[PDB]
Amino acid sequence: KVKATLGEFDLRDYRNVEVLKRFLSETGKILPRRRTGLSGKEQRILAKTIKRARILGLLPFTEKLVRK
């Protein structure tokens, strides 16, 4: 899980890309709660947060496929 392999970080700091990146998939998509390892309230916020970081082009909106 991503919460377990990571430390103390602000859920609201929409700039910190070095962190958020771990919350997106191999594609641009946002990890599901099963992955992130977050809570009900926690995820709700990460949603809003990335949705922001995206806009200031710090986080993608979508990626392409890799392995091959």
């Binding site: 909106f61 979508t62 392409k64 496929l65 890799v66 392995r67 091959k68």
Partner: protein, 115 residues
């Protein structure tokens, strides 16, 4: 002859016909081969064999220009997306890597009846 080694292989797969198009680094189409172009005319094209042929005959026109390396691109979900790739992976072309950028709308055009 025009001598442009190393390029791109766009493979457009559908539920009615799979087509290839080969391009130079910049994104310009060198040679392109469809299914209906081989010889097939209908239900036939969506066959993995059709894709196979589309892909193979598609490299043979590319070696014509001495194409050596290629980055593979795949669009959509068709019957035999696989076969065409696996096809070029043996056509005689060095495959740099496979890429999927199947186009997905973040919700826009209210699609038609059969969704």
């Amino acid at each position: 002859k025009r001598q442009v080694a190393s390029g791109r292989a766009y493979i457009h797969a559908s539920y009615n016909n799979t087509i290839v198009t080969i391009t130079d680094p910049d994104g310009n189409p060198i040679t392109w081969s469809s299914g209906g172009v081989i010889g097939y005319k209908g239900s036939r094209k969506g066959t993995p064999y059709a894709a196979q042929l589309a892909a193979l005959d598609a490299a043979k026109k590319a070696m014509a220009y001495g194409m050596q390396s290629v980055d593979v691109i795949v669009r959509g979900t068709g019957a035999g997306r696989e076969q065409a790739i696996r096809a070029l992976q043996a056509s005689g072309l060095q495959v740099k890597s496979i890429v999927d950028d199947t186009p997905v709308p973040h919700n826009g055009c209210r699609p038609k009846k059969k969704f």
